[PDB]
Write a protein that binds this ligand. Sequence first.
Ligand code: HEM
Ligand SMILES: *[C@@H]1O[C@H](CO)[C@@H](O[C@@H]2O[C@H](CO)[C@@H](O)[C@H](O)[C@H]2NC(C)=O)[C@H](O)[C@H]1NC(C)=O
Ligand SMILES: [Ca+2]
Ligand SMILES: [Ca+2]
Length: 336
Amino acid sequence: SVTCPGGQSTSNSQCCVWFDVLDDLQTNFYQGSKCESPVRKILRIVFHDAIGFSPALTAAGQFGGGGADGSIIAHSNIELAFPANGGLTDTIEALRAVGINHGVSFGDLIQFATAVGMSNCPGSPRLEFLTGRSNSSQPSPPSLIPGPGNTVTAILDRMGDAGFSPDEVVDLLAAHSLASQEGLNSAIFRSPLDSTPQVFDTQFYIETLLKGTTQPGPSLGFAEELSPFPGEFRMRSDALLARDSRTACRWQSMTSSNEVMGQRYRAAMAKMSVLGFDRNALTDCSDVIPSAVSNNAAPVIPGGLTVDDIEVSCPSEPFPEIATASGPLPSLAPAP
Ligand code: HEM
Ligand SMILES: *[C@@H]1O[C@H](CO)[C@@H](O[C@@H]2O[C@H](CO)[C@@H](O)[C@H](O)[C@H]2NC(C)=O)[C@H](O)[C@H]1NC(C)=O
Ligand SMILES: [Ca+2]
Ligand SMILES: [Ca+2]
């Protein structure tokens, strides 16, 4: 049956080239299979590439974007001039080279490097991986990426037009559990968005719900809110979506189970990877993707804060019982 040149067994001969780009990305792009800044920039890139898709622009007779087509790399010259795409040139060039050198399409390569990067971060699910997305693209239309200063209505309408329900917007946001900011407030470069930027866990949902108490840098940056402890950055859209009645109950159900969070996240990501494509025309090469190491820590309210410090915003469901840590307040180191 299909055994690839390297002795691995796969479902289809179309999957064999991906064991070679797996080796290149792990050794080089990810610097020895690490979960550091290259994984976080690729998670920004996969979203910014796939969300350039708008059925409403198509309906009005305009080109609406090809979705998860790799247009952010093939047309980086126009797309990296967009407001939301700063701080990405170096990662896009590293990916362009792996793509040209292995003979794989840019849209497939971004989806693949996202599943491989996430496998380097403890706690992550195994993301689905499909191959066969066409390599040709047209530049994404501008203004299709949600920004941190937008209202929840603006974010839900843009996301809804691409096809996601309010629940799936919250599910997709689990990627901010592996995150920092570099361009919102340059003064606290790489300040984490949750206290474990290297563990794909529930802490992002717990901590954006805590009362904003601390200014982490000299001044406040673009779309920055007060955060719960030194070193942690809180962006306005995350604070608002955690508290809005349209998204608050789903945000609260994501706080106590890393297992439920990862299932939901895997499902929204599989939907986001085929925006602009018919998944039945693609080949499944999910077995090429390795397992991540498991996360054995339980969810916690960090540093002595309790349930009285979180601003419960889901009026129907009571806040789940999460553990407390007998701590002094943490000060987070920049994400690596
Ligand atoms: C409501 C939509 C979203 C908004 C408004 C938003 C906004 C942002 C902003 C402004 C940054 C900081 C970038 C910087 O200055 O360095 C950021 C970082 C990040 N976002 Fe989001 N985001 C959203 C959705 C997502 C989605 C769905 C993903 C991917 C599945 C994602 C993954 C990330 C990651 C991993 C980072 C960290 C980048 C790094 O540490 O270098 N975001 N996001
Ligand atoms: C996918 O399309 C892009 C063009 O949009 C190709 O990228 C170019 O590849 C050539 C030769 O391989 C390089 O010298 C160019 O610099 C690349 N241009 C850009 C903008 O990256 C790419 O080769 C195509 N890949 C496949 C498999 O067809
Ligand atoms: Ca695109
Ligand atoms: Ca985390």
